[PDB]
Design a protein around this motif. Structure first.
Motif, PDB file in Angstrom:
ATOM      1  N   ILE A  21      85.467  20.811  52.205  1.00 24.99           N
ATOM      2  CA  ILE A  21      84.184  22.005  52.667  1.00 24.99           C
ATOM      3  C   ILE A  21      84.360  22.664  51.300  1.00 24.99           C
ATOM      4  O   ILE A  21      84.973  23.432  51.403  1.00 24.99           O
ATOM      5  CB  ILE A  21      84.077  22.357  53.331  1.00 24.99           C
ATOM      6  N   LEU A  22      82.957  22.646  50.621  1.00 25.00           N
ATOM      7  CA  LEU A  22      83.160  23.748  49.218  1.00 25.00           C
ATOM      8  C   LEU A  22      81.649  24.645  49.192  1.00 25.00           C
ATOM      9  O   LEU A  22      80.960  23.258  49.322  1.00 25.00           O
ATOM     10  CB  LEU A  22      83.574  22.667  47.856  1.00 25.00           C
ATOM     11  N   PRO A  23      81.847  25.489  49.420  1.00 27.13           N
ATOM     12  CA  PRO A  23      80.512  26.013  48.885  1.00 27.13           C
ATOM     13  C   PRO A  23      79.685  25.892  48.270  1.00 27.13           C
ATOM     14  O   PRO A  23      80.290  25.938  46.652  1.00 27.13           O
ATOM     15  CB  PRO A  23      80.463  27.495  49.444  1.00 27.13           C
ATOM     16  N   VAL A  24      78.085  26.187  48.022  1.00 27.18           N
ATOM     17  CA  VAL A  24      77.591  26.130  46.891  1.00 27.18           C
ATOM     18  C   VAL A  24      76.981  27.351  46.396  1.00 27.18           C
ATOM     19  O   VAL A  24      77.090  27.354  45.482  1.00 27.18           O
ATOM     20  CB  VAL A  24      76.914  24.559  47.115  1.00 27.18           C
ATOM     21  N   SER A  25      76.210  27.488  47.546  1.00 23.66           N
ATOM     22  CA  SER A  25      75.282  29.175  47.702  1.00 23.66           C
ATOM     23  C   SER A  25      75.508  29.630  48.412  1.00 23.66           C
ATOM     24  O   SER A  25      75.634  29.424  49.820  1.00 23.66           O
ATOM     25  CB  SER A  25      73.969  28.407  47.188  1.00 23.66           C
ATOM     26  N   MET A  26      74.703  31.561  48.078  1.00 20.19           N
ATOM     27  CA  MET A  26      74.957  32.259  49.372  1.00 20.19           C
ATOM     28  C   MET A  26      73.747  32.842  49.353  1.00 20.19           C
ATOM     29  O   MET A  26      72.936  32.310  48.753  1.00 20.19           O
ATOM     30  CB  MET A  26      76.159  33.453  48.957  1.00 20.19           C
ATOM     31  N   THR A  27      73.162  33.429  49.940  1.00 24.16           N
ATOM     32  CA  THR A  27      71.882  34.039  50.384  1.00 24.16           C
ATOM     33  C   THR A  27      71.655  34.894  49.675  1.00 24.16           C
ATOM     34  O   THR A  27      71.761  35.784  49.229  1.00 24.16           O
ATOM     35  CB  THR A  27      72.199  34.939  51.846  1.00 24.16           C
ATOM     36  N   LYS A  28      70.125  35.152  48.793  1.00 23.15           N
ATOM     37  CA  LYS A  28      69.716  35.710  48.048  1.00 23.15           C
ATOM     38  C   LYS A  28      69.194  36.974  48.975  1.00 23.15           C
ATOM     39  O   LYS A  28      68.385  37.090  50.032  1.00 23.15           O
ATOM     40  CB  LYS A  28      68.986  35.017  47.906  1.00 23.15           C
ATOM     41  N   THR A  29      69.377  37.906  48.107  1.00 23.99           N
ATOM     42  CA  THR A  29      69.051  39.687  48.400  1.00 23.99           C
ATOM     43  C   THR A  29      68.571  39.990  47.883  1.00 23.99           C
ATOM     44  O   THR A  29      69.330  40.158  46.814  1.00 23.99           O
ATOM     45  CB  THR A  29      70.078  40.251  49.396  1.00 23.99           C
ATOM     46  N   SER A  30      67.375  41.048  47.416  1.00 22.74           N
ATOM     47  CA  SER A  30      67.312  42.043  46.751  1.00 22.74           C
ATOM     48  C   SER A  30      66.693  43.490  47.582  1.00 22.74           C
ATOM     49  O   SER A  30      66.025  43.252  48.846  1.00 22.74           O
ATOM     50  CB  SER A  30      65.743  41.601  46.277  1.00 22.74           C
ATOM     51  N   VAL A  31      68.084  44.555  47.059  1.00 23.23           N
ATOM     52  CA  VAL A  31      67.622  45.841  47.733  1.00 23.23           C
ATOM     53  C   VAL A  31      66.627  46.961  47.107  1.00 23.23           C
ATOM     54  O   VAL A  31      67.026  46.709  45.743  1.00 23.23           O
ATOM     55  CB  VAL A  31      68.912  46.102  48.415  1.00 23.23           C
ATOM     56  N   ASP A  32      66.161  47.530  47.713  1.00 23.43           N
ATOM     57  CA  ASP A  32      64.726  48.082  47.081  1.00 23.43           C
ATOM     58  C   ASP A  32      65.626  49.362  46.905  1.00 23.43           C
ATOM     59  O   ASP A  32      66.232  50.176  47.591  1.00 23.43           O
ATOM     60  CB  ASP A  32      63.622  48.413  47.455  1.00 23.43           C
ATOM     61  N   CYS A  33      65.435  50.635  45.837  1.00 22.93           N
ATOM     62  CA  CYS A  33      66.292  51.561  45.444  1.00 22.93           C
ATOM     63  C   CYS A  33      65.357  52.822  45.903  1.00 22.93           C
ATOM     64  O   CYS A  33      66.091  53.669  46.537  1.00 22.93           O
ATOM     65  CB  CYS A  33      66.425  52.083  44.028  1.00 22.93           C
ATOM     66  N   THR A  34      63.781  52.488  46.473  1.00 22.86           N
ATOM     67  CA  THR A  34      63.270  54.037  46.401  1.00 22.86           C
ATOM     68  C   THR A  34      63.405  53.854  48.000  1.00 22.86           C
ATOM     69  O   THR A  34      63.682  54.791  48.272  1.00 22.86           O
ATOM     70  CB  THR A  34      62.028  53.758  45.732  1.00 22.86           C
ATOM     71  N   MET A  35      62.789  52.874  48.641  1.00 17.73           N
ATOM     72  CA  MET A  35      62.724  52.274  50.101  1.00 17.73           C
ATOM     73  C   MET A  35      64.547  52.833  50.549  1.00 17.73           C
ATOM     74  O   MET A  35      65.017  53.065  51.845  1.00 17.73           O
ATOM     75  CB  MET A  35      62.257  51.219  50.343  1.00 17.73           C
ATOM     76  N   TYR A  36      65.240  52.168  49.242  1.00 16.89           N
ATOM     77  CA  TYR A  36      67.118  52.185  50.721  1.00 16.89           C
ATOM     78  C   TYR A  36      66.964  54.316  50.041  1.00 16.89           C
ATOM     79  O   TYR A  36      67.957  54.613  51.266  1.00 16.89           O
ATOM     80  CB  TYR A  36      67.594  52.415  49.181  1.00 16.89           C
ATOM     81  N   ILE A  37      66.418  54.686  49.128  1.00 13.07           N
ATOM     82  CA  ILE A  37      66.384  56.304  50.046  1.00 13.07           C
ATOM     83  C   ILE A  37      66.111  56.957  50.428  1.00 13.07           C
ATOM     84  O   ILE A  37      66.102  57.102  51.967  1.00 13.07           O
ATOM     85  CB  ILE A  37      66.086  57.285  48.426  1.00 13.07           C
ATOM     86  N   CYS A  38      64.727  56.978  50.725  1.00 11.67           N
ATOM     87  CA  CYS A  38      63.543  57.062  51.791  1.00 11.67           C
ATOM     88  C   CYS A  38      62.430  56.414  51.451  1.00 11.67           C
ATOM     89  O   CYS A  38      62.042  56.648  50.662  1.00 11.67           O
ATOM     90  CB  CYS A  38      63.202  58.422  52.293  1.00 11.67           C
ATOM     91  N   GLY A  39      61.363  56.470  52.311  1.00 10.39           N
ATOM     92  CA  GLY A  39      59.646  55.445  51.859  1.00 10.39           C
ATOM     93  C   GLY A  39      59.270  57.110  52.254  1.00 10.39           C
ATOM     94  O   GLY A  39      59.199  58.003  53.539  1.00 10.39           O
ATOM     95  N   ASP A  40      58.090  56.760  52.325  1.00 13.80           N
ATOM     96  CA  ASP A  40      56.244  57.777  52.520  1.00 13.80           C
ATOM     97  C   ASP A  40      56.682  58.755  52.338  1.00 13.80           C
ATOM     98  O   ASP A  40      56.376  60.116  52.337  1.00 13.80           O
ATOM     99  CB  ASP A  40      56.113  57.144  54.380  1.00 13.80           C
TER     100      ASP A  40
END
Lengths: 49, 49
Positions: A21-40
């Protein structure tokens, strides 16, 4: 056994199926810097820039 | 919510729920809708679509 004039040849065989059993790809993730600090809020954006 | 619980926060330490200070009502805090803005456009020398 080990001998010079002795030899072993197979008289019968079998067909075995195995599994690797050989893995090919993983889950695509994108994290925002501003929303990770805070929004609004402009305090996170001015201090982050 | 239990009768004595005022607010609550999620695993990120941001407040996801609040109790009505005037009447007895229980409201969840759901942040305003967001996501990323993805732009599907050709080259600048192709068009502005």
């Amino acid at each position: 056994a080990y001998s010079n004039n002795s030899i072993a040849i197979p008289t019968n065989f079998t067909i075995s199926v195995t599994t690797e059993i050989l893995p090919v790809s993983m889950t695509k993730t994108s994290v925002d810097c501003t929303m990770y600090i805070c929004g609004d809020s402009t305090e996170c954006s001015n201090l982050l820039l | 919510f239990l009768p004595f619980q005022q607010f609550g926060r999620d695993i990120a330490d941001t407040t996801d729920a609040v109790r009505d200070p005037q009447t007895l009502e229980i409201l969840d805090i759901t942040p305003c809708s967001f996501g990323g803005v993805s732009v599907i456009t050709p080259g600048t020398n192709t068009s502005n679509q």
